[PDB]
Amino acid sequence: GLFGAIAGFIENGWEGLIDGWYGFRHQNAQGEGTAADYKSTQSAIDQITGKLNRLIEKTNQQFELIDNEFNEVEKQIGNVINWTRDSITEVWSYNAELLVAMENQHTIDLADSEMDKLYERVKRQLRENAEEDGTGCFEIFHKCDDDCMASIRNNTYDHSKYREEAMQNR
Amino acid sequence: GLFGAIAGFIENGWEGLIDGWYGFRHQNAQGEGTAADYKSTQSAIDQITGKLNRLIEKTNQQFELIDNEFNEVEKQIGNVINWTRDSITEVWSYNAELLVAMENQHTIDLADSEMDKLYERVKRQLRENAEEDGTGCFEIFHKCDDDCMASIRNNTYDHSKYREEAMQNR
Amino acid sequence: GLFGAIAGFIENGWEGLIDGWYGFRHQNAQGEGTAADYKSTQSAIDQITGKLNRLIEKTNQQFELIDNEFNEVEKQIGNVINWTRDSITEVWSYNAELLVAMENQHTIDLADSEMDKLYERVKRQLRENAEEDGTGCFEIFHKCDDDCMASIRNNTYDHSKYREEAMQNR
Amino acid sequence: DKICLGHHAVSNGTKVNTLTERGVEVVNATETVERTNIPRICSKGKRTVDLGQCGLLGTITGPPQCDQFLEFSADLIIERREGSDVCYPGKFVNEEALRQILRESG
Amino acid sequence: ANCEGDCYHSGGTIISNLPFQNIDSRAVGKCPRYVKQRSLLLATGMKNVPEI
Numbered sequence: 001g002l003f004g005a006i007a008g009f010i011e012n013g014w015e016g017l018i019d020g021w022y023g024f025r026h027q028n029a030q031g032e033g034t035a036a037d038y039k040s041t042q043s044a045i046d047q048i049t050g051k052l053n054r055l056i057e058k059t060n061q062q063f064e065l066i067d068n069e070f071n072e073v074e075k076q077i078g079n080v081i082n083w084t085r086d087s088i089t090e091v092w093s094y095n096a097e098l099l100v101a102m103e104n105q106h107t108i109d110l111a112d113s114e115m116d117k118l119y120e121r122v123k124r125q126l127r128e129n130a131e132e133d134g135t136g137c138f139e140i141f142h143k144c145d146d147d148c149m150a151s152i153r154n155n156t157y158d159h160s161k162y163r164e165e166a167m168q169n170r
Numbered sequence: 171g172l173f174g175a176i177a178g179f180i181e182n183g184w185e186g187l188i189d190g191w192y193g194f195r196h197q198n199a200q201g202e203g204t205a206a207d208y209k210s211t212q213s214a215i216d217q218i219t220g221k222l223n224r225l226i227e228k229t230n231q232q233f234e235l236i237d238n239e240f241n242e243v244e245k246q247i248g249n250v251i252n253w254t255r256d257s258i259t260e261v262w263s264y265n266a267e268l269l270v271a272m273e274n275q276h277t278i279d280l281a282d283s284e285m286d287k288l289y290e291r292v293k294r295q296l297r298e299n300a301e302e303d304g305t306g307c308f309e310i311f312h313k314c315d316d317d318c319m320a321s322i323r324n325n326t327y328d329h330s331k332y333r334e335e336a337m338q339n340r
Numbered sequence: 341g342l343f344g345a346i347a348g349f350i351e352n353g354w355e356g357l358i359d360g361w362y363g364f365r366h367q368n369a370q371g372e373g374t375a376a377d378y379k380s381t382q383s384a385i386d387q388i389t390g391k392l393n394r395l396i397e398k399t400n401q402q403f404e405l406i407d408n409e410f411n412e413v414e415k416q417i418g419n420v421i422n423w424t425r426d427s428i429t430e431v432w433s434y435n436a437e438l439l440v441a442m443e444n445q446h447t448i449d450l451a452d453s454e455m456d457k458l459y460e461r462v463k464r465q466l467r468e469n470a471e472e473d474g475t476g477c478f479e480i481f482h483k484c485d486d487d488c489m490a491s492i493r494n495n496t497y498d499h500s501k502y503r504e505e506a507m508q509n510r
Numbered sequence: 511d512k513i514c515l516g517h518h519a520v521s522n523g524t525k526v527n528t529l530t531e532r533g534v535e536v537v538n539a540t541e542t543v544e545r546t547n548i549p550r551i552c553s554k555g556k557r558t559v560d561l562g563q564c565g566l567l568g569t570i571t572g573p574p575q576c577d578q579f580l581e582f583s584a585d586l587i588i589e590r591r592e593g594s595d596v597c598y599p600g601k602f603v604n605e606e607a608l609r610q611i612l613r614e615s616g
Numbered sequence: 617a618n619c620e621g622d623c624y625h626s627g628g629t630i631i632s633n634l635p636f637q638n639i640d641s642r643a644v645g646k647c648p649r650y651v652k653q654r655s656l657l658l659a660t661g662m663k664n665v666p667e668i
């Protein structure tokens with residue numbers, strides 16, 4: 001998309017992540033572990049459902065019947081009615097196609113956005129203690145055990161403690 | 171927003187900043203200061219008044235009366251006229267609603283954009299002599315007085331003449 | 341634009357570049373050399389031509405004649421017809437102008453986007469072996485020749501080989 | 511040693527269309543164009559008159575088929591193809607106008 | 617009488633919250649606008665990027 005995260009520097013997504021939309025998956029001394037991030041998952045779903053609720057809602061304009069099916073109306077006013085109705089149906093078909101298209105473009109470029117926002121939150125969490133791998137992975141220098149990763153998730157990770165070690169491991 | 175700066179990693183806004191839209195706030199030995207930035211505020215308001223200038227102007231098409239208010243026209247042609255007019259009204263309501271919606275979305279995402287552009291300019295000025303706070307601030311390892319900050323806000327800051335002092339302060 | 345790469349921190353473009361859209365321009369010991377990057381070019385190109393494919397095509401819906409150029413129709417029904425056609429013509433003019441304006445905005449911001457995606461790609465190839473210029477250049481620290489550059493532009497660049505030198509030369 | 515960021519995906523994608531690409535595959539999409547029809551006239555909370563063989567204009571003149579509707583009262587008036595506005599042949603002048611009147615007559 | 621609707625046509629009733637329909641252009645009542653397209657799919661999710 002526009003932010004180059006989805007179908008971008010993150011090569012592909014994880015078909016096993018069912019907890020939510022976006023999450024972390026760490027490899028450390030204590031084994032692999034994958035778990036979602038509620039914050040951004042909800043940040044995207046709330047926006048998509050905003051689109052829906054704004055779109056699927058009815059107008060209160062009621063239309064009456066102006067021509068007849070069983071007893072056809074006069075020819076000139078019938079050709080005018082049909083002409084008008086075809087022009088209107090053309091307008092609405094165009095409005096609908098353009099609408100769906102642009103809401104889909106903005107939806108994809110929105111999820112891409114929320115991903116890049118998460119990665120760029122982890123990045124500012126791990127200030128100098130970790131290096132950008134490039135495939136959306138962060139290479140941690142110090143020893144981050146299965147409880148330290150949780151501090152990375154909860155945004156409770158204090159980098160000052162581990163900065164001494166990871167800095168030197170340059 | 172899409173870029174994650176406004177109501178993103180920046181917690182909230184500075185209600186007192188009547189000098190402009192965006193700005194710098196510095197905290198050093200000589201105190202605390204708040205100043206604005208004409209470049210980004212202007213590159214934004216130009217764009218917004220660009221939108222206004224594109225929308226706030228009327229069409230030169232003139233319409234005529236085709237029915238009558240005091241002496242109602244024939245029933246059939248009046249019902250056709252009404253059905254057509256109400257259909258037009260529905261179309262223009264829809265186009266208006268979607269116009270305001272999609273122009274507001276792009277307005278806010280535009281403001282987010284300008285903020286993130288500033289916060290990346292200040293970093294590329296402030297090469298490794300400073301590190302990213304996380305709340306949208308820059309932690310500088312060397313000493314910046316008021317003239318130092320005013321040299322950052324003018325894009326006049328040179329990183330080499332403060333390279334050593336701060337790098338050793340890793 | 342929205343991404344501040346084209347007409348942003350990258351001062352301007354290169355009229356000399358006729359190979360593709362975005363490219364690299366290096367100045368090392370073995371003289372200056374510049375050549376274009378194909379993946380980004382073909383991305384932006386395939387997207388813009390996607391817009392054209394969606395636009396350049398015509399409806400199969402056929403409209404008949406409801407008035408007469410040689411022998412004017414009855415006056416009232418003719419004024420209703422002209423009123424309807426003027427209202428529709430007005431609608432399609434608005435839809436056209438809005439469509440083109442938004443497709444241009446999005447196009448520009450998309451090329452801006454692809455530029456930022458290339459710059460941020462290389463920035464992650466050269467993990468700690470270079471430093472951010474501020475004008476879209478990458479100040480390398482190790483002695484990269486006209487073959488190590490071609491290993492950048494193929495992404496075959498290994499940063500661990502040349503890490504020691506560039507690190508020490510900090 | 512490391513930590514990775516990423517998103518989800520499914521093996522059964524749903525294809526949509528965008529400004530810039532035709533048939534881009536996404537996770538879950540929905541429908542905006544209704545085709546689910548109910549093959550009945552749904553009239554909960556409406557006084558309905560199924561005219562049947564009685565034509566709508568015949569409620570004024572009163573041919574035999576329309577005896578049962580001489581003073582009908584409804585919020586929803588349902589016409590049928592088998593309606594016959596007349597018994598002795600003839601036709602109303604400006605008949606569609608009077609039809610449009612009687613349709614919104616209650 | 618059990619079913620409840622507010623948009624009719626010669627073939628029945630259009631019960632739907634969707635903004636469009638491809639059933640009958642002449643339908644009357646409080647009705648979604650008629651469009652030519654059989655289906656217009658609105659995305660409610662991100663791009664599907666699976667393992668190759």
Ligand SMILES: *[C@@H]1O[C@H](CO)[C@@H](O)[C@H](O)[C@H]1NC(C)=O
Pocket residue numbers: 245248249252
């Ligand atoms: C058409 O609408 C106007 C107001 O919108 C109303 O005064 C007039 O009576 C309507 N005509 C018919 C034939 O119902």
